[PDB]
């Protein structure tokens, strides 16, 4: 059932503008993290790993980066071994939309657009296994 998932436009860190909408179809799984941010260093290796599976069933990654700079962004994608996309809140304004807290926090959001799940807190590689799987189409 779901709700309907707040649609943005961001940039990545090379200045392409990537739409939520424009993912429609795809599960996307939509990881509100900062580079300081403990949790987020700590699930990020899980998230790449996931992603070599789900990638071809389906699953998109969007971890939108909460208000910091590109080289800020780009070195952390480098040292954490980042393969999937990563957009920059530069203003907060999705942070706000998506009403998020603290970080990390994710979106699992259905091939139709809608959040079917939000989950607070630093994710296992297990419960992102599991996360992916529910939002495949």
Sequence with gaps: EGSDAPNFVLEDTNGKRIELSDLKGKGVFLNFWGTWCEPCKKEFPYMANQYKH????????????????????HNFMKSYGVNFPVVLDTDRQVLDAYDVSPLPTTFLINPEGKVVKVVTGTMTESMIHDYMNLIKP
Excluded at 57 to 73: F, L, R, T
């Design 54 to 73: 789900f990638k071809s069933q389906g699953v998109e990654i969007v971890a939108v980066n909460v208000g910091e700079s590109k080289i800020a962004v």
